[PDB]
Write a protein that binds this DNA or RNA. Structure first.
Ligand code: CA
Ligand code: CA
Ligand code: CA
Ligand code: CA
Ligand code: MG
Ligand code: MG
Ligand code: MG
Ligand code: MG
Ligand code: MG
Ligand code: MG
Ligand code: MG
Ligand code: MG
Ligand code: MG
Ligand code: MG
Ligand code: MG
Ligand code: MG
Ligand code: MG
Ligand code: MG
Ligand code: MG
Ligand code: MG
Ligand code: MG
Ligand code: MG
Ligand code: MG
Ligand code: MG
Ligand code: MG
Ligand code: MG
Ligand code: MG
Ligand code: MG
Ligand code: MG
Ligand code: MG
Ligand code: MG
Ligand code: MG
Ligand code: MG
Ligand code: MG
Ligand code: MG
Ligand code: MG
Ligand code: MG
Ligand code: MG
Ligand code: MG
Ligand code: MG
Ligand code: MG
Ligand code: MG
Ligand code: MG
Ligand code: MG
Ligand code: MG
Ligand code: MG
Ligand code: MG
Ligand code: MG
Ligand code: MG
Ligand code: MG
Ligand code: MG
Ligand code: MG
Ligand code: MG
Ligand code: MG
Ligand code: MG
Ligand code: MG
Ligand code: MG
Ligand code: MG
Ligand code: MG
Ligand code: MG
Ligand code: MG
Ligand code: MG
Ligand code: MG
Ligand code: MG
Ligand code: MG
Ligand code: MG
Ligand code: MG
Ligand code: MG
Ligand code: MG
Ligand code: MG
Ligand code: MG
Ligand code: MG
Ligand code: MG
Ligand code: MG
Ligand code: MG
Ligand code: MG
Ligand code: MG
Ligand code: MG
Ligand code: MG
Ligand code: MG
Ligand code: MG
Ligand code: MG
Ligand code: MG
Ligand code: MG
Ligand code: MG
Ligand code: MG
Ligand code: MG
Ligand code: MG
Ligand code: MG
Ligand code: MG
Ligand code: MG
Ligand code: MG
Ligand code: MG
Ligand code: MG
Ligand code: MG
Ligand code: MG
Ligand code: MG
Ligand code: MG
Ligand code: MG
Ligand code: MG
Ligand code: MG
Ligand code: MG
Ligand code: MG
Ligand code: MG
Ligand code: MG
Ligand code: MG
Ligand code: MG
Ligand code: MG
Ligand code: MG
Ligand code: MG
Ligand code: MG
Ligand code: MG
Ligand code: MG
Ligand code: MG
Ligand code: MG
Ligand code: MG
Ligand code: MG
Ligand code: MG
Ligand code: MG
Ligand code: MG
Ligand code: MG
Ligand code: MG
Ligand code: MG
Ligand code: MG
Ligand code: MG
Ligand code: MG
Ligand code: MG
Ligand code: MG
Ligand code: MG
Ligand code: MG
Ligand code: MG
Ligand code: MG
Ligand code: MG
Ligand code: MG
Ligand code: MG
Ligand code: MG
Ligand code: MG
Ligand code: MG
Ligand code: MG
Ligand code: MG
Ligand code: MG
Ligand code: MG
Ligand code: MG
Ligand code: MG
Ligand code: MG
Ligand code: MG
Ligand code: MG
Ligand code: MG
Ligand code: MG
Ligand code: MG
Ligand code: MG
Ligand code: MG
Ligand code: MG
Ligand code: MG
Ligand code: MG
Ligand code: MG
Ligand code: MG
Ligand code: MG
Ligand code: MG
Ligand code: MG
Ligand code: MG
Ligand code: MG
Ligand code: MG
Ligand code: MG
Ligand code: MG
Ligand code: MG
Ligand code: MG
Ligand code: MG
Ligand code: MG
Ligand code: MG
Length: 74
RNA sequence: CGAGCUGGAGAUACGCUUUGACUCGGGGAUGUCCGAAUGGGGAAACCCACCUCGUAAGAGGUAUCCGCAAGGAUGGGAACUCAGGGAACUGAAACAUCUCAGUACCUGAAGGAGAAGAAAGAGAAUUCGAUUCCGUUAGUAGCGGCGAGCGAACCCGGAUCAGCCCAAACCGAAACGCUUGCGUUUCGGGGUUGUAGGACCAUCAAGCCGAAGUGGCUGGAAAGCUACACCUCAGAAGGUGAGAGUCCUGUAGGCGAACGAGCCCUGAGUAGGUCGUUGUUCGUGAAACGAUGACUGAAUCCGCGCGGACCACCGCGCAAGGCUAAAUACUCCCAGUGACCGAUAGCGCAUAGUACCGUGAGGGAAAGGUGAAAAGAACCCCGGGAGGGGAGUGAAAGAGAACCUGAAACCGUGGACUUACAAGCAGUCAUGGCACCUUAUGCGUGUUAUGGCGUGCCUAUUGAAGCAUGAGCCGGCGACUUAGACCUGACGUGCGAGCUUAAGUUGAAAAACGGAGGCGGAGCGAAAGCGAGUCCGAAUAGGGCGGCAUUAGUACGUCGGGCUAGACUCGAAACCAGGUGAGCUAAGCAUGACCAGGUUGAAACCCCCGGGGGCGGAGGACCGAACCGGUGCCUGCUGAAACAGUCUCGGAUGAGUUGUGUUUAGGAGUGAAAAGCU
RNA sequence: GUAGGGGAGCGUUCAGUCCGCGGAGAAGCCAUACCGGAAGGAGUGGUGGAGCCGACUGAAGUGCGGAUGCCGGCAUGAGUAACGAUAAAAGAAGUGAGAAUCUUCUUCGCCGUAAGGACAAGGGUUCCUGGGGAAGGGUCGUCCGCCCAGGGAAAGUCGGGACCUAAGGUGAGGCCGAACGGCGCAGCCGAUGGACAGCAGGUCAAGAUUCCUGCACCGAUCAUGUGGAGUGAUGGAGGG
RNA sequence: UCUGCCUCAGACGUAUCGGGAGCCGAAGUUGGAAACGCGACGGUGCCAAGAAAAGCUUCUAAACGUUGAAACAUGAUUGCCCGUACCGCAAACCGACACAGGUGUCCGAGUGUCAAUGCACUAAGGCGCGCGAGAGAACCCUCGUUAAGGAACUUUGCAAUCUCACCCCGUAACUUCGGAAGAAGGGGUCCCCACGCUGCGUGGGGCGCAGUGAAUAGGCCCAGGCGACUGUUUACCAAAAUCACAGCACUCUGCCAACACGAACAGUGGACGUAUAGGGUGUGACGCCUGCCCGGUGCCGGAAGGUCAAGUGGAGCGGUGCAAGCUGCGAAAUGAAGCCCCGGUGAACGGCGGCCUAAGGUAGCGAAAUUCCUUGUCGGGUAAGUUCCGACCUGCACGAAAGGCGUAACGAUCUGGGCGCUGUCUCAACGAGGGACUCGGUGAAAUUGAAUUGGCUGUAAAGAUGCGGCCUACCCGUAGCAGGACGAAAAGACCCCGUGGAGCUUUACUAUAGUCUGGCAUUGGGAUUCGGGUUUCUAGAAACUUGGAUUUCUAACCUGAAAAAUCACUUUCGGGGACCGUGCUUGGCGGGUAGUUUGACUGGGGCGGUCGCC
RNA sequence: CUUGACUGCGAGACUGACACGUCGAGCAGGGAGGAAACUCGGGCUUAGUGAACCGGUGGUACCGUGUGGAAGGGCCAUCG
């Protein structure tokens, strides 16, 4: 379960294939080409302390842990 | 409760019961084995253990995850709720954006509901005041290949309404932390916000009681007819030999149990930002705001967020902490009701997820009737029986268990009139013959001979007897509907310059109330706006519009059309989702088994000088059975068989054949490769 | 007079109200020469045996010849084709209501690396005995693998388990992943393989390394005696 | 450090328990044969190199004892759970059936015949296949013989003859020296006796039309095409020239390999393999060989110049405020990969031409599995030859690893000829058995608007039993035939149509898995040169950097070895290393995948033409 | 000589299913040629052409979501 930093997980968004830089700056408006989905996550870490452990953490979670222990020391 | 009971079960034997059975209401106690299954294993319901009890027979324990511990969780639910995922046919008369639709489906969590909920809101009145649901706003504002199409909210009227506690500024700790009366997280007091607050300093149950009719008549049988009565807080209903207010059960009404269920501070890796995206009417549009995936990253009450780029002013509100009943949804289950069905209907089932089909997932029938009462036919006759004929019973056996009615197609027996030189969509009209006489002695009815005339029905078509479609026949089932405060007409009713309600409230053997809101009443314009005038325009020319013809409107109802939705019924090839299949077949893997018999004669090694002899016994070698296979012909072609048989033929120690066990699958597997097998 | 528009109506079920009818007989069914302009409606008779007509109003699952329409029944082809290997059958005797077909006897013909025998999968009482004769049997049937009832099935040593491991399947911890889930060491499951103690006979109608008779073998516990001391693992080696 | 010990397969004897033909119990001999079974785990050869675990034997660790041991002898006691009947190559399993199909293993006797599980007949055993009886017509099926002829049949000698087993003699081109080969051909085959040898051989005699006396048991040869070869394929119309194949070649791949399955920094396969290996592609034994063209496309290098995204940069232009400030855009310069551009590359996609393009066919073959005209022309074979063989070449439209020419052997391959022999034929006959016919029993099916259903000729929607005229025809059946009923079966697979479908293709459109690439994060100190920042100070440089860039470092992170196989821990420890991998984002590539598009008229559609206006 | 290759309009008719298309007297503002009457809103006439959508450029000050602006939109003219 890719849930990070005992906190948060992956999300999903459609990604849209914009056919033009035209409209809104002087042309027939932008057309459309893509209706397809994607994911998005983040990556591994180490050294949990409820007593001792090592688990997934996120980028900004490693930041928050660097600026002080936060519910679970590090 | 007050005499029966011994399940359906209908079949006897056996008993039990007025010291109260049986049945009903309410508790206990037993509770094999499987199944979350949980001592370990497992192909569910079967195998194998261990530990204390220990006299044995028997009992108790032995899964995992939460927690010191109590105590909790795991699994199961028709639909309903929320969440994580998330289609495609389809419409756009093609198709990409778009729609279908966050629909189906899958998955997770929970309950009797759920979700949501107590304003950094709505919004433009310095109005409002948690959430949800209904009406209306309104198909308005908007969105949109500005196409198809999609589509809010506020105000207002209703259903129900409840608001509540923590964090933190400060006390008092304790423990630990360091240069010496301090600050990281626990525990109490205290303290909980925007008209800013707070700190520190002055009834339902099982049940019981319950009124009133007798004589004659028809009849197999009284409840019907009749004649006289009676009760009625009770004429709702069902049973009873046919239709019962007064025969039974009941009904109105009354009572009713031990245990039984039930209302100095005010939240930071955040707010905010850039990149990707997305939600609400929000399709990158001038696109705000919320939402996170990545990287960054503030401020305190002279402060922070919003008011649809953005700025100033003016307003509304205090984010980053939690809980929260009721109005809402649904229907496995129970009760009542029905301009609902009544045996091809109604649920698939008058019961069956059965029979039956499938390896499976899964699919899936037909279903009825003696009689009031079994009195269910003793006895006799033909027959092995089956079947029948009598006798009995019964009102009826014109009800006899192939048991209400019993149509039609189809099969027969008997009778009338007819037919063995005739050419024929089968009739029709005319006349003679022969029968017959119950709407019936006639302008009859049945049937005939002979004349004239005469190309089935439907559909589809320029055109059907067509050698063009459909159909064996008869029975039954079978196709222009429904919905919505939607549009537009005809007819009819009410009220009329005015007409009317919606949601709901209260009453229901009945309907009233409810003005929120909707339609007329003013038009012209892109619009601001003017206004019987208005727009174009520098004034005179026009468009539309009122006057005059003021056609009078509105709410209902029936009807003709329209729109939207399966939209007159039946019919695809296909597309997508989640599952079931490698017990056939294509392959792999592990472990086993199999190949009569015969022919040939390789290397090596030993002799004579690469040759000859000795010997040896090699091979995707040869002939050939088993076995594996399918070459050619015939047969078979409603088969012996949904791929075979006889004859013939190929391989037959190898790239061989075969058995167990197991692995691989749907855009996928497998394939000595045909798009073949799955 | 076709598509099409318009008008007036007939019949079916259900509902409300009326008028009534019915065991001296209702609906339904059956015959029919009467009536109405049509859809239709009445009269009378036969059948039936318990409900029902007429009028007015209302609401519809409301009118069938078709759809290679559905369900069901019944026909035509027709006493037709077939009766499932060209391995033949004949006589006598018996049983019986009944016999080409069942039982017996004596011959004949057919298989004989089978068309004989013993097992495994699979089937599930098909086995034996006594009865039966509807249907099943491609005819018959006294018979049957059909129907009814009663019996039959015996293991320390055979095959499996209480022993082992292969592919494969699982799998605490562990590694991954929107969810459900996907991998995975040890260990565990898993026979198609490894290990392991009996042979000869007899015999129920129906069982046989199982029961019986004869005579063995294997493990375990105990006892008597000899011995009167070292046993010697979830680990090592050989070996299988 | 010096053959011998053990074992009994099995035989023999003695005894004993059984069995034994038979009317309770007799005999149990001599000679021969012989397993895939047993002795056994024997011997020999070979390459492709042939499970694991427990039981079992042996050692200590711990513990328990060392005057109630291990072990042995006898006696006793003990012995759980499940399967076991019957069918079991089929009437009981799978095939809807009491179905001519299918189903793994074991045993499967005798006589004859080189051998044998073959063939014939038979033992034990098991069966005569659950309608029968007659008749001896047509036709149909499976068979026997056939005069004279002998392929004249036909698409084709398809079918069916012929041949057939063992022994002897004898065998060609050609060859990869094995083979072709059972080449072809010719002879023998029984019975008796005598003689020699180990059932043979030598001789003599005998009978028959005939002696593998019946059954099983090759017809052969000449010449081509294709493929070398054994083998593999379309379960159910194709077995082949298809597929594969040994051999060859190009290219990729340094090891957490390339590549492939995968939600995945997981795990696997490659492979417990490591360049003499693995993947991909194409050719296809062997022999002689594999030519010209790099312009286009692909690929490998180059990387002076042009173009190019996010990002950095933000000069300048505007709103709105009294102002402070807030705010919408927004350049130049610098930013990757890629593409343009330049070289090379063919056993890379390809190309080797019409009376300029990059070049224009080297060998070899050629009227062909390719050749239109075409039956080309000559020759061969035939009486006669569109076929076939050989030359020729005018190759519509061969050609060198989509390989070119050859090749012995192989082939249920295809094509032409010959010998032999035949009912394939002239041209059919006679015979047999199973149906067809008849009788008794049981008794279907497709089809069917209804039928009282004729001929000619004419008309009708244009092929008439049914309409018109004329002819013919007494009623009803049974056995037969196959013209008609536009006979039956499947609402035509051809064709056209539908703004239907689906499979596949590419330089059609559009996305996208995948993959490459710049920026940011994980992500860290240091030295070094630093375009520059700030306060430092007699144009100037020390505290320092915001960074970029080689370089280097070891705490991140990855990865490896050590009693602890995956993982976790220390590691005397080892290597990589701020790269990689991963997360977001930028641009490229991306038929690997995916959703779709691909007009109409049209004397059927397509091709050609044509779509508006005068 | 000069622009009538004009702005505001359009009584009436031809023509077409629409939607487009054609001809136009006369009115105003302002011009032009003529001495005048008068004729000029393109060419002897009939071909030299594209709805809508979305956008570019110039004006106008209508809309602009609390108000005052501005972003954005509308109207007029034109381009693709
Ligand atoms: Ca007959
Ligand atoms: Ca017939
Ligand atoms: Ca002859
Ligand atoms: Ca018959
Ligand atoms: Mg979503
Ligand atoms: Mg009672
Ligand atoms: Mg009873
Ligand atoms: Mg269990
Ligand atoms: Mg359990
Ligand atoms: Mg338990
Ligand atoms: Mg589609
Ligand atoms: Mg569409
Ligand atoms: Mg789409
Ligand atoms: Mg649903
Ligand atoms: Mg669910
Ligand atoms: Mg649940
Ligand atoms: Mg309200
Ligand atoms: Mg009653
Ligand atoms: Mg009375
Ligand atoms: Mg707060
Ligand atoms: Mg944000
Ligand atoms: Mg954004
Ligand atoms: Mg758009
Ligand atoms: Mg704002
Ligand atoms: Mg926001
Ligand atoms: Mg605002
Ligand atoms: Mg009814
Ligand atoms: Mg039913
Ligand atoms: Mg019925
Ligand atoms: Mg059903
Ligand atoms: Mg089944
Ligand atoms: Mg089943
Ligand atoms: Mg009854
Ligand atoms: Mg009977
Ligand atoms: Mg009787
Ligand atoms: Mg009587
Ligand atoms: Mg009767
Ligand atoms: Mg009756
Ligand atoms: Mg009867
Ligand atoms: Mg009755
Ligand atoms: Mg009846
Ligand atoms: Mg008769
Ligand atoms: Mg008659
Ligand atoms: Mg005659
Ligand atoms: Mg006559
Ligand atoms: Mg006739
Ligand atoms: Mg007549
Ligand atoms: Mg026609
Ligand atoms: Mg006609
Ligand atoms: Mg006809
Ligand atoms: Mg017809
Ligand atoms: Mg047709
Ligand atoms: Mg037909
Ligand atoms: Mg309305
Ligand atoms: Mg509504
Ligand atoms: Mg007017
Ligand atoms: Mg109306
Ligand atoms: Mg219309
Ligand atoms: Mg629709
Ligand atoms: Mg799918
Ligand atoms: Mg299998
Ligand atoms: Mg064997
Ligand atoms: Mg052999
Ligand atoms: Mg020798
Ligand atoms: Mg061979
Ligand atoms: Mg050979
Ligand atoms: Mg076979
Ligand atoms: Mg095959
Ligand atoms: Mg051969
Ligand atoms: Mg061979
Ligand atoms: Mg694919
Ligand atoms: Mg009556
Ligand atoms: Mg009538
Ligand atoms: Mg009655
Ligand atoms: Mg209907
Ligand atoms: Mg009709
Ligand atoms: Mg019909
Ligand atoms: Mg039918
Ligand atoms: Mg047959
Ligand atoms: Mg007999
Ligand atoms: Mg007798
Ligand atoms: Mg009989
Ligand atoms: Mg017989
Ligand atoms: Mg018999
Ligand atoms: Mg006898
Ligand atoms: Mg057998
Ligand atoms: Mg069994
Ligand atoms: Mg059994
Ligand atoms: Mg039996
Ligand atoms: Mg018997
Ligand atoms: Mg019996
Ligand atoms: Mg019988
Ligand atoms: Mg019976
Ligand atoms: Mg029978
Ligand atoms: Mg024993
Ligand atoms: Mg065993
Ligand atoms: Mg095990
Ligand atoms: Mg494993
Ligand atoms: Mg697993
Ligand atoms: Mg086994
Ligand atoms: Mg044993
Ligand atoms: Mg016996
Ligand atoms: Mg037996
Ligand atoms: Mg025995
Ligand atoms: Mg002896
Ligand atoms: Mg083990
Ligand atoms: Mg047995
Ligand atoms: Mg069979
Ligand atoms: Mg077999
Ligand atoms: Mg043998
Ligand atoms: Mg033999
Ligand atoms: Mg022999
Ligand atoms: Mg044989
Ligand atoms: Mg048998
Ligand atoms: Mg004959
Ligand atoms: Mg034959
Ligand atoms: Mg002769
Ligand atoms: Mg000859
Ligand atoms: Mg000829
Ligand atoms: Mg010839
Ligand atoms: Mg041929
Ligand atoms: Mg032949
Ligand atoms: Mg030579
Ligand atoms: Mg030679
Ligand atoms: Mg040859
Ligand atoms: Mg002679
Ligand atoms: Mg001779
Ligand atoms: Mg012979
Ligand atoms: Mg040729
Ligand atoms: Mg070949
Ligand atoms: Mg085939
Ligand atoms: Mg197959
Ligand atoms: Mg074939
Ligand atoms: Mg890894
Ligand atoms: Mg690996
Ligand atoms: Mg090839
Ligand atoms: Mg070359
Ligand atoms: Mg020639
Ligand atoms: Mg030719
Ligand atoms: Mg010649
Ligand atoms: Mg010639
Ligand atoms: Mg010929
Ligand atoms: Mg030919
Ligand atoms: Mg030639
Ligand atoms: Mg070629
Ligand atoms: Mg080549
Ligand atoms: Mg070739
Ligand atoms: Mg060649
Ligand atoms: Mg072959
Ligand atoms: Mg030939
Ligand atoms: Mg010839
Ligand atoms: Mg019979
Ligand atoms: Mg039939
Ligand atoms: Mg004519
Ligand atoms: Mg004619
Ligand atoms: Mg005629
Ligand atoms: Mg006629
Ligand atoms: Mg025939
Ligand atoms: Mg068709
Ligand atoms: Mg399509
Ligand atoms: Mg990508
Ligand atoms: Mg991108
Ligand atoms: Mg495609
Ligand atoms: Mg593309
Ligand atoms: Mg066309
Ligand atoms: Mg002048
Ligand atoms: Mg004018
Ligand atoms: Mg503008
Ligand atoms: Mg404003
Ligand atoms: Mg503007």
């Amino acid at each position: 379960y890719l849930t990070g930093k005992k906190n948060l997980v992956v999300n999903s968004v459609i990604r849209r294939g914009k056919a033009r830089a035209d409209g809104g700056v002087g042309r027939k408006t932008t057309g459309i080409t893509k209706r397809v989905q994607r994911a998005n996550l983040h990556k591994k870490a180490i050294r949990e302390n409820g007593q001792v452990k090592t688990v997934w953490l996120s980028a900004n979670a490693l930041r928050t842990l660097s600026k002080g222990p936060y519910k679970g020391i590090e």
